[PDB]
């Protein structure tokens, strides 16, 4: 019981019905207020209203039903971020058809693998994805129909959404009389792609139950965004990412104006943030490093900007603080989660921002930190392995029971593979690694930097660096190294290589050990303690 950390009750009691039913209810409301904007394309300036989105979604839902799609079918969406992206997604959710968002820049192998897993009957794609989709269709006969998202009429012999609708929808159809289907909450809502360290991406099977819980969080005044009229958000998260899907769908539930970009550009981003008077900006992790460097932020009027949020992994405390200062904010709105957990399971509570913290456990969820050795449940300010448990946890990997049971134990705990601790206020901190610095006698800093140096070497494929401690005084930097295919190196060559890369005898002082693979990914990064043992055992 103790050391299990629980989220509080939701602010609002749970709505009834599927994700389609709840989504339909909100969209129908916003649709009847003319001029309410759902999506805005920053590159061409075009707006699409909730009225337009709602009507298209209902038409697509009934059209797909008439076409013959049922609970047993899936559709895929393959496209750059666009105004039309979520139209077939809303429609599919209305009728319980699973949706597989598919990376538009997948190579031929990755694309085939993704669609091979989701097995869609219809693929909605942009003009820019048509050729690659045509190619994969030759290999995947389950794909019976291709529909073009960003064309009004037929394009290259393929139907547009409008033409598809015209063929399969009677002229008696009234969008405001349409009623979404009712079905079991364990019905598949999405198949999202996620890669650990193990080769190719797997299919993450998210249920309607998963999604409606996200719908609770998204409009929660503490753990989401309070629904307020004329709220706009600029998002540069790929819609086919887990957090891209879960944040964007949530914004639709909230009735927000979602400003999107096909591709990130500094000027256009800042100009749009200013001119659309967005209250929030949602960024991918690597863009925080970017804006920490940006000098242009001050030259724009961002007086309406209330928050900058990370739509992905947790961020470094210093990078976050630097970006906060750039945008004249007290802190960054953060969240920790996995594709496998639908969305963020730990979120910065509104008005309760601690620097370096990824926030607090969300409603309906539980979290625990376990001893890296004993598996023992830990108290506050004790670093260990982070586990997550709750109703946003995926049904499982598609057709991969083994991978599922390796990640999720029999009681529903997800083994995140990340190291963390929580403080006395139950704020969680994700630590990247387990330590972070090996100390000479006074100081030396060789974490990821030495690893990066090692990775650049032609003969070196992978590498992990840890500190080796012994009664032999102090702490010596050491590394395990994965050589390339059929290549030869000595310990000295690796050491001398690093020696000629940094100063102060902070270049491997313990000893290099060659291995077949870097200790542990366990679906994530480097197992620092595993590395320490292997190197320690080697020293004698």
Numbering used by the authors: 5 to 544
Article excerpt on this structure:
At the core of this natural phenomenon lies a fundamental process of energy transduction by luciferase enzymes that convert the chemical energy stored within the ground-state substrate (luciferin) to an excited, emissive state of the product (oxyluciferin) by a spin-forbidden process. Although beetle luciferase systems share identical substrates and chemical reaction sequence, they emit a range of different colors from yellow green (λmax ≈ 560 nm), which is typical for common firefly species, such as the North American firefly Photinus pyralis (GPp) and the Japanese firefly Luciola cruciata (GLc), to orange and even red (λmax = 590–623 nm) from certain click beetles and railroad worms. Here, we describe the first crystal structures of two rare WT luciferases from Brazilian beetles that emit light with exceptional colors; a luciferase from the head lanterns of the glow-worm P. hirtus (Coleoptera: Phengodidae), the only known luciferase that naturally emits red light (λmax = 623 nm; REPh), and a green-emitting luciferase from the firefly A. vivianii (Coleoptera: Lampyridae) that displays a blue-shifted emission relative to common firefly luciferases (λmax = 538 nm at pH 8; GBAv). Biochemical and structural analyses of the two luciferases, combined with computational modeling, provide the best insight yet into the relationship between the structure and color of light emitted by beetle luciferases.
To identify structural features that are important in the color tuning mechanism, the crystal structure of GBAv luciferase with a blue-shifted green emission of lmax = 538 nm at pH 8 was determined for comparison with the REPh. The GBAv crystals diffract to a resolution of 1.9 Å when free of substrate and crystallize in a space group P212121 with two independent GBAv monomers in the asymmetric unit. Although the N-terminal domains of the two GBAv molecules are very similar (root-mean-square deviation [RMSD] value of 0.1 Å calculated on all backbone atoms), their C-terminal domains have different conformations with an RMSD value of 2.1 Å. Thus, although the luciferase in both molecules can be considered as being in its “open” conformation, the luciferase with the smaller aperture is maybe an intermediate between the “open” and “closed” conformations, the latter being attributed to the structure of GLc in complex with the reaction products. The structural integrity of loop is maintained by interaction between K524 and the backbone of G528. In GBAv, loop is tightly held by strong ionic interactions between E354 on the loop and R337 on the N-terminal domain.
